[PDB]
Amino acid sequence: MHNYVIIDAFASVPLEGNPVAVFFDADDLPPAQMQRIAREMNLSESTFVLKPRNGGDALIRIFTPVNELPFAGHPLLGTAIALGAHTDNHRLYLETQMGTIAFELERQNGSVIAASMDQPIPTWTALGRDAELLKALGISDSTFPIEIYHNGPRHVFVGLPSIDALSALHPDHRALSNFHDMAINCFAGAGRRWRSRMFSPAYGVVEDAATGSAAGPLAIHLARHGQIEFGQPVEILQGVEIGRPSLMFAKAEGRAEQLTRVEVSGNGVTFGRGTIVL
Amino acid sequence: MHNYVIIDAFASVPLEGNPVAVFFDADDLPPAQMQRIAREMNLSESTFVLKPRNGGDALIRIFTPVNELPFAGHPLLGTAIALGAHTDNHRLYLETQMGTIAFELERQNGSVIAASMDQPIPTWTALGRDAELLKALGISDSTFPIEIYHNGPRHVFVGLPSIDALSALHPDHRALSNFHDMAINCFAGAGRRWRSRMFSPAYGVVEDAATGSAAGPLAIHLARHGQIEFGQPVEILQGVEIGRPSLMFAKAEGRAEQLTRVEVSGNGVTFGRGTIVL
Numbered sequence A, B: 001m002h003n004y005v006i007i008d009a010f011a012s013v014p015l016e017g018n019p020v021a022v023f024f025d026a027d028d029l030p031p032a033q034m035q036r037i038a039r040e041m042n043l044s045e046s047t048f049v050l051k052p053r054n055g056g057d058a059l060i061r062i063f064t065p066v067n068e069l070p071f072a073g074h075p076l077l078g079t080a081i082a083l084g085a086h087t088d089n090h091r092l093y094l095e096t097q098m099g100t101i102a103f104e105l106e107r108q109n110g111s112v113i114a115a116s117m118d119q120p121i122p123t124w125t126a127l128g129r130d131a132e133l134l135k136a137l138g139i140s141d142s143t144f145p146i147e148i149y150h151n152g153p154r155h156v157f158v159g160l161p162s163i164d165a166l167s168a169l170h171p172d173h174r175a176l177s178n179f180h181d182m183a184i185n186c187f188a189g190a191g192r193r194w195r196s197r198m199f200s201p202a203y204g205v206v207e208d209a210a211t212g213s214a215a216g217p218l219a220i221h222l223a224r225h226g227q228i229e230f231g232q233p234v235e236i237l238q239g240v241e242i243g244r245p246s247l248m249f250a251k252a253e254g255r256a257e258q259l260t261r262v263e264v265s266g267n268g269v270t271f272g273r274g275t276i277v278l
């Protein structure tokens, strides 16, 4: 009674990137049923495609196995790529609890292979728990200031002096569990090319493959702290250490005090397709 | 390139019971790829149907998102029910690392709706950590002796004086994480009808819907401690508190010192069907 696809977001090859399940024609499902379906699937998120209510192309509801989210990065990227198979539009306007998100779809011979999204503009401040966090991560200091960004989820950024040092992290996940309602993103790199690892007991993931909602904030962080300029894109490679390499591209336009746009893009690929009996 | 089904094991209605993904015609998949697929699906287990090697009907390999298992209860029950759609045999002999498991399939008009399995005969001993475990569970004492059973996984049983007392448990899951390589099964009831709740940080589940490998051991536990006789079946209802009610039926034949058969049965239902591109 409902068709779905499994999209690996921020990947061009199946079994890379970050999976999301996308359910079509979901207007007949009450939200309690959507939540039960997301629990059944047990993917980080399942999304449901609904008729639009405010002039967009579709309304997307986003569920983890436990609760509904107002916005999420890789789930929305994967939803846009899944829906691109059922429309010819170059642009896709997806309504969410946080407003209407604009996507640009990139096709080859009718197949959507990538998409770019405008993200909510983040806010940020110092975390103020540096010694506790560094101890949990097993290191003595960060390179750049340890700041926490909010764009729906909360993302903390800790900088490492080299990619080898980032790969060598073995965090104490018990100690990280004292950091509620946030994800810890550790990064290293230079110029256009950065590496990331994300850990979040609060969001139910030991180590994440592709934290799409962290890519925009990271571009802002790098620009604020002088490693890139506002208006310059970065390529962020995540999930290497867990065998789910994921490429996220991000750019923040404006200046710190007046951000005009935060763009995140990536490839996506279909892993599977099916139908559920409900 | 591979078809799969999602079976809700120990349920007759979708979104009840415990899901397992079953992949058909998997002989072309190397085990590293099977493991990557199980990680992609992120269900408690994915199983893969292979040609038999020792005279059975099929060889089943069982993967969690992280590792391969030699045996598992609800995953094998769901596999037998999924495969029943592709055979006419009344009995199904499924090879596993722990040997060939015999299943009896129950059909209505060609559809397999339930199955019974013979399980490995468990061993057991006192846990010897009673005060620590009771404190983690938030209670002062068990009804029956706290014993740990081994049949592949390890299952501890803690008895509660009433079903209301079982439903009222709010375990300290941090404290339960100090119990490695085992699941904690709390039970209550009388006569033929028992209720269970299972918690296992070690096996990556906060609270499980249907712990099929615990049902055989529970029947043995109840018989040893005089609540039933050997040779009498019990009906175990699990997962009520998490909205995944699951009915498991179990019977242990013989006597404690010479068990001849441990049978577990349940309904199963198809939640979805699909195909993956690998």
Ligand SMILES: Nc1ccc(-c2ccc(F)cc2)cc1C(=O)O
Pocket (backbone or CB within 6 Å): A044, A069, A070, A071, A072, A073, A074, A075, A152, A153, A154, A203, A211, A212, A213
């Ligand atoms: N994987 C995720 C898990 C949780 C959240 C989140 C969003 C809004 C909010 F208010 C709280 C949490 C986002 C993501 C993501 O992928 O962006």
Ligand SMILES: Nc1ccc(-c2ccc(F)cc2)cc1C(=O)O
Pocket (backbone or CB within 6 Å): B044, B069, B070, B071, B072, B073, B074, B075, B152, B153, B154, B203, B211, B212, B213
């Ligand atoms: N959900 C499960 C998770 C783990 C195991 C397990 C099996 C063999 C072994 F040696 C260790 C662990 C079984 C189940 C099950 O459902 O029976």
